[model samples]
Target: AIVFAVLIAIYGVYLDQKIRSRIDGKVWQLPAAVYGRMVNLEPDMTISKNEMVKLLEATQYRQVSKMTRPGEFTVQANSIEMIRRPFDFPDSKEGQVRARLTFDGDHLATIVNMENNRQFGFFRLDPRLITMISSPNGEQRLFVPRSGFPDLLVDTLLATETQQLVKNLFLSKANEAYMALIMDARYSKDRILELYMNEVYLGQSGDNEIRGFPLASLYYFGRPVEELSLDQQALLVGMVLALERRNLVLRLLYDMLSARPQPAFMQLVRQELQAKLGDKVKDLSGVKIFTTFDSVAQDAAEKAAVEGIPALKKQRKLSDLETAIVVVDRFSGEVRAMVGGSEPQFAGYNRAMQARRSIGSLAKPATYLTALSQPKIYRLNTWIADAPIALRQPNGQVWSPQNDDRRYSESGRVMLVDALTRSMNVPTVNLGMALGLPAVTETWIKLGVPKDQLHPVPAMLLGALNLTPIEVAQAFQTIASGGNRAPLSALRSVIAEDGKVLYQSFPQAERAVPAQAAYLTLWTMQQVVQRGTGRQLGAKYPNLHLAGKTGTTNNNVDTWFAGIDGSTVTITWVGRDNNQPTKLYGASGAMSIYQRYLANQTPTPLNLVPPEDIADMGVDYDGNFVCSGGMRILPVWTSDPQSLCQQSE
Candidate 1:
């Protein structure tokens, strides 16, 4: 009896501690926030009653027939009816007016009168009253407190209930099964609103996870969190009930407002909202989210991708292929817009950052850049024999590299710039041989290319190195940032719930190259884009002044276009993950994404200033350098031209 009593006491104490810990622990639910997309409103514009009515109907508002005249209609929800009162006003009015309209369910509650005058129909109100009930100005929609538990946790709760002595807790129906748990209204409104914002799962696409109104606003409408109008807010909140079936939500809310009623669902939503929000629930006055995203640029990029990808696929006859695109600000390095694949919704893989494929001739520039740093052995006019040479490996095997077009010039003399522009394999191999493969490998490593990816094969001269689109982007970003070698990152800062900045990214600039050498390399790349294989890009974007390289891997399996303009640095990749041979060319594959993106983007001028050590000497077509006075200057190989140009003889 003594042993039994002690065991019971110990067990009871253990259980009490566990229960106390569970009760005191912070909720592990993901934080949600309502993000509003900013809509740039024009001045001197009036919104009509009919247009306002259509906007309200889009929010799932129901209309009822009245005994009055033809234009007069009544908006009803949960046994409450609102009379539609229309007034004519001048076209230059701004803001929304709210009137204390009396209904059967309650005394005078606020009804919004929007100034929009474009539509031709009866005035209507949003069926989802969250926007209507919370808006202080009535111009924008509010995220009203809706009844039910969070949809994301519903499945987990159900599974828990099924395991705990219950096979079925309640009858399963589409609407009722998805209903969320209602929180008590005694809590502050902000707390309930915060819970709702943080707990909701707006949408998912591959590695991208979004919660609350803010991210959803940007995802669907391409706007920030602060600029949403009432109609726009209604559209966003309506998605909460049926996120997966957005088309259904749109159709049901827009088309069936007058014919059918969703009184039960609306009542349930409102009751839950009032229960959780209490006096804290109010109308959405004006909410907006200021983002780094440019709506105009985003719209343009989307249109360009939608049209360009299909055209390129048709041109190449490639099917079931994937592509990824990213546009970043060159100055700030802010990612303006990103599309993971041709089908943005398809989350199978991300080719931009994850796809590691061999880069063919694209590797030539880095080798050439290495050569340019060595002034004695390398110069713009340095001669390299284009004839084929056999290289002996340590294993005693002789390997000879071949050109892409199966043609090689014997005793052909070419300069470094011309050699890179033509993408001649023989000259590039000779340059790599002269620079020493170990040195080139070190450069690649310093540039953040993994060491394991560096192969001693001579084909590495022709982009035999494997790298992802993002890796290529970061490498080029280093050059664009004037030799600042900072690793590319997506996030800027993350703030915790307690208003503490948990993480922040600062600018890290590692000077990897001398300013003179880097500038020379950038100038050479400009020539590649102007006259070489990338000239096709020049035809469409004549005034944009971009510098970029086109990359095609072995067997044409991967095609890439990595470029940098003033405003954005974009790297695009198009290929299949299975490493299957592709009919897509670099110009047609990745360049299509570039072209589409550039078409919609406003040009920011390039502002690269030449370093003091580098002197610009104009040269003729014959490769003979000319002085500022138009006199022929002696070749630097024969004698140092600086002395000849500066001497008084």
Candidate 2:
């Protein structure tokens, strides 16, 4: 009896130790939750009430007759009353808020706190859960505290008592039952219920095994357990019994299909996480990644690619055409949206970052900016010859470049702005030849191009060097953000389970190009949109004060567009994979996708704020400043303050 008693006591102690170890340590392999950009609602914002309502609905906010709790809202006329859910931002935790938003027509007019009757200047809605990152052997769960436990779910779990686990390995059925009774005495009923609810298996999604009430709710009803309807709650309760009867294989076959919203962006996130965290992210469990991804822009980009690509294919009569788009915040250089393929969900070739095709006229700005940097020689009205010339190469071959229209300027000369605005080939070549290819190459490097990628050849002056859409966007981001080159990033912060910031992206802007030169070049690009190749976009959206350039390569092999406004710099590329010549130009091809995307967004007009050194002056045809005889007014980048036309001179 003494020996038997010692063994029993030891076994009980062993069982208790194992149980406590499982509970106290990591109880669940919690998947890393990736969230999109938070939606900020402030006064004077241009978001329409209908759009705001749709955004709320998309984020799973339920519309009720009256707003009484978090995640619920009520819409009446031009106003919306909502109780915002609590969220943990990288900086701090925001609790539930009771607020009312009144819209004055299309603009969000005022945000009033319903709880305290105080008006708020800014409010943020929790970002949408993009996806969950888990290990290959997926076991996903989001832990729910006792406070989140609903009374109905608890009762339903209590009514069906069947359970087991660690004790099953060592004890027989009778012994397991006895141990469970002993455990009941050792732990509180609420604690046991919490453990049971968390430990139980609900179903399988692909290779991922869905466990616990929280995950089960997400899987079965697409929401949190507390938000589950009575029908959903009962269905979940009933599913527990169904699991006992159903074959796991049969269930797997039944599942066999699903889609994650943004696989392209998710692929980018995985790559960045791998590069930034390295071996530290061997397992993404319990980590939260706050991305710079803007869901609004992402949705618009995806829709444009998905719907616009097919339309272009049919219209252009092409087989196998693909496109890539990258949109970055103008100031921050954060990658707000990226579309790698026409099919946004397909985890295929990410053309946005990978496909390095000829940039065409997109590189013209770099060449022109190099000349403009020498403010003493080149001004906005400085004339560059458009006449053609043949150059003898070292290999005994003659190279002659022609205009796209097969016609030179009538006067054989055009203003510096006219050459770039019209995307003329010979004038750009003449200007690049004067500046020397090395100077233009140096300018390209400063604009964000890797030095090794540049081939300082004459053909490169017309964008012969291959570059990806993302690369082009990065370069343009510097000009768009007033000459401060910023490193683009898709990730904002990687947070730990305890809300500790492990990593953060700092898009430190470095002074690259002269702000004055960058400003003048962008100003010239405005004329490109106003009357040049990008006129279609400008004509269609007159309200948007956007400046952009369009690119059409030899035989139209690659069509590209780079556009910038106050908020974003968008780059788009369209071409065939087999290197077949496309018959589409920059205006009708890639720009079409941009037009569709712009249709989806509220226009943010660009106001080019000139640098301190830049002055508005009138210059004559000979590139000499004149207040009286000058034919046109232009923005001149000059440190010397010369009065308009020098009144006495």
Candidate 3:
């Protein structure tokens, strides 16, 4: 009886503590800042009531009944008396408020209301909305956010739990609101702006999660975000309220014209902001967030992809196929522009970094790199046969490989350069066999290929290895950086809000391959792009020199284009995550994105300057030693060329 009584008391205390904790606990919520597009005008200028009304309507303000006609609205608000305008107004008094009742030459057709105010509570606008800023080339439409804008947006849009529409959009599992805010505060304003501009979720459409202002701008305006005008900025801002519903301009216009239902949530947002700031509402100018993205290059890359991918898809009859594109500066490895998929607004999985697919012949370069390390036997002109081969697997499964084109000769010998350039699978497998599997696998591990996912099959030589596009890029970058290893990095540097350098990324290159071997390997790859499987690229970009490999897995499940020019290395993959056959070839599938990206980008030259240990020598069609001018020559020791010039080929 005493034990039971004690248990009851303990249970009572536990329940009481639980209740107390619940009452004191605070639910996690992010303050999402809402913003409107900046409408730039001359200083001290007064906008007409009509233009003001149009602007306010663009912001989705419902017209009140008191203002019927333009004259009537003017009288109600206060006559068009010249009002003193400052260069900038506080968020509380920043935007204009105008209401008009319009009668279509008779009875009132409708009442139109417009209001332009600071995004949240600062005079600055949202980082995503500000357009028209200076770029490297000239003044272009750039979206850079100033400080405090992120906080303002957070406070206004994400003030309460009920306002949190997509929890994932604003916060992470760690309960960090304004991902940009945390990144900015923890990193730098530039990093914050870059992430905010790149990672923000605009809307959810079916399987697509539309994200980022740049992508949203292209989808809605059919132009790059950097080229957006003031009016276009306003439209983009509207998308912030309800991205999926008012995603397109035509849709937004139809809704506005028909007096369609406004997002109740947005209306609630306005009410909350007005209540909090009251008369000080207009003083909120959003913060400007700076980014490292190049506007002109981004625009060109996006335009090319937008136009090219669809045509290729149609030609291939690849209905329901998804595509991604990434353009990076070869020197800094800075990503200039990236399209995650066909629909810029759609976002869910970032295919560029997340999609793991078989790399097929793309694995040849790695094999060749591994082989080149043993310079005594292998050279660019080494011979390999392109005949069928069988491999015995440890699992008792017999693996037979075949080329995609099925044009292999029974036993014809081909040069290593020709084998890689033409993407000959048999030669690659034979090379892998000769080099031994452990050596090739070790090379991959040293190049940052995750060990856990490594497949121990001989087919890895033909790119049966599963890797992300980013991984492929990193490996290629190691070769591009003069055989120096490259670490994966998305950020250049991080600065605190007060301008303190918290973290910085420097070019980290380790000697992954001998300079001589790396030079030979790169030279071979250059030929691949110039006249091989990457021939399509050569035809499209004749002047731009590129060295790359095309990969197509068995059954056409995955397609890859991995290449490096100068300091930048890019890897693009096209395939479904389900591992289903994409029914597309590497050249027609992934290379299409590569070609499009290169179309608008200037080719950065490769760092082919041979290292001291290696000397440049010419070889003839038969792989015989030749002089620089193609004169027939005998093999001569690089240390003593005169000693062996006695015999000629």
Candidate 4:
């Protein structure tokens, strides 16, 4: 009887304490939310209506013909009308508002409201919700206020689990356990309600207990949570679908998913993610995540890979064939997309950053750039023989190099630019021999190739080098950046839950090539589009000026197309995994996808301009240097005709 009285008195005191706690606190304990990029509305923001729609869809913004709710929008011929949802940000509050936006092509033209055609300096949509965050141990927990007690949830749990115990005593103890969250936080009523309702139970995930007010949503929970089906149902009855994103949390999931291959593309990403964030993952188990994963770019990449491979496989008529791609930002060098093989699920293989295949003629640019680097010693107009060449290998074996067309012609001495344009194997080999193998290898090292990848042998001239598609991109980006090497990256920035910056990726830049040499190479590679092996590819996109190299390995075992544009540089390869003859050359196999990717990607012309040091060198009728666009051709020692004659008096 005395114990019962004590229990009654204790229950009354606890109930009274909880009531006060509820009055002081904020709404539920929310799971840490993750965010990706923010959509800022400014006059100069670059976005077409289509791009806008893609961003909207990515953020889960519903585009309806009519706008009835805060997250929905309607598109007009001239404008977009949207009802923004209320969002409470760490630094700002965005209540529900209606706005209209007008576009001029890909740029934001003006903001208007039909009722009052209005314009503001700038506006920002809420940060996008990318994915859920997680707890340190991946356990989901909820915290509730002792004051509110989640009376229904408590009642349901009591009715389900501990009716065998005294109801008032059980709740009295529960209220004591929950009081710390409410009283400690001085949380508001809304805050406390959010806490207990979100609690999800895990079976043995961490050998932890299910806490109150934890955000264990549908996608996550424990079997102890299974012990609370009625509790979960009651929690669901009053639940609202939540949408929130966090950068660190979202990136964490990508790596978590990437490091493992169950879903897709996880193995590599996990390691990469760990490089950036190891300790951070501990705090984000089951946390929802959000990201700026451009579906258009991904779809395009996937379509170009999985679907495109099968067709190419069918066309090339090879039962066993594979392909890989790496697309990078022209300026930032961030890898925008990558793929390997043609699996519909994007599973199995990742060759883009893998598949070390012989680079073939793709290695010529490194050799050419080596010669072009010494502008005085060799210029683009420097000539070389297209005639057959024989090399006495270190082992006393005499070897003769051949061209894909079956014979190296004695087509007189063609310009150095023509040598690269025509992809003359003999000329390149002879040139590499002339420059000394060290100089060729030294040039590749400067352009991001490791020294060990090259052999001192003479066959190194005909692309005896093996490299992955990503390596090709790194090298080409050095050319596209006008001598500055742009390191490839995929991440943008990481933001913590409270809007604090956790990490940021800045593009690494270094002038790895001679400013003039890179410029000359860019100009020479441009000719590849204008008059070389890539000429047909050049015709495919008439407006966009793409500079690239076409590579084909021995027996047509590997086909490659590595190209650069104003905004992107991509390396593509198509071949059989086992090095079997695919019988498809660069243009017929890899070049098709390279052309298709540009058609779907950053097709902007490679806004190239000759560096100040470069000039159009001119020559005399006798093939001697005279003037370059009226500038006297300095130091004419080519010993070979610089040009047949386009010279000044």
Model 1: ten consecutive residues of lowest lDDT: 161-170
Best by TM-score: 2
Q: For model 1, how big is the CA root-mean-square deviation?
A: 15.6
For all predicted structures, in order, the TM-scores are: 0.60, 0.90, 0.56, 0.73
Q: Weakest 10 consecutive residues, lDDT, candidate 2?
A: 251-260
The digit string of per-residue lDDT tens for model 2 on 1-649 reads: 5699889878888877766776676766678888887767899987788778877876768889966557888989989999888777776688779999999977899999988989887898888777778655477677777668778667655565423643422333666775686678777767766666666678886788787788788677666777765445655665663443233323232232111057667777889898998868555457888887887788888899999899988987877889899999998888889999898876578889888888989999998899989888887788899887798788989889999878987788999988999999998999999999999998888889777789998999988888888889999998888888998888888988877777887758899999899999999999998888899888987667788999999988999999897799999888888777878889988999999988876557889999978878877656667755578788888766465536327
List candidate 3 stretches off by more than 4 Å.
1-297, 328-332, 395-397, 405-411, 605-607, 626-649
Ranking by lDDT: 2, 4, 3, 1
lDDT tens digits, residue span 42-122, model 3: 222333444444433332222444542221123234222111111122223332334233333212233333453222221
Evaluation by lDDT, superior candidate among 1 and 2: 2
Model 4 spans with C-alpha error above 4 angstroms: 4-47, 81-101, 105-108, 111-189, 200-269, 276-293, 344-348, 617-649
C-alpha lDDT (0 to 100) for residue 462 of candidate 4: 88
Model 4 global lDDT (CA atoms, 0 to 1): 0.63
Candidate 4 residue lDDT tens string, 417-449: 778887878788888899998888877877776
Q: How many residue pairs clash (N, CA or C atoms closer than 3 angstroms) in each of the candidate models, in the order given?
A: 41, 1, 44, 57
TM-score of 2: 0.90
Q: How much is 96 displaced in model 2, in angstroms? A: 1.9
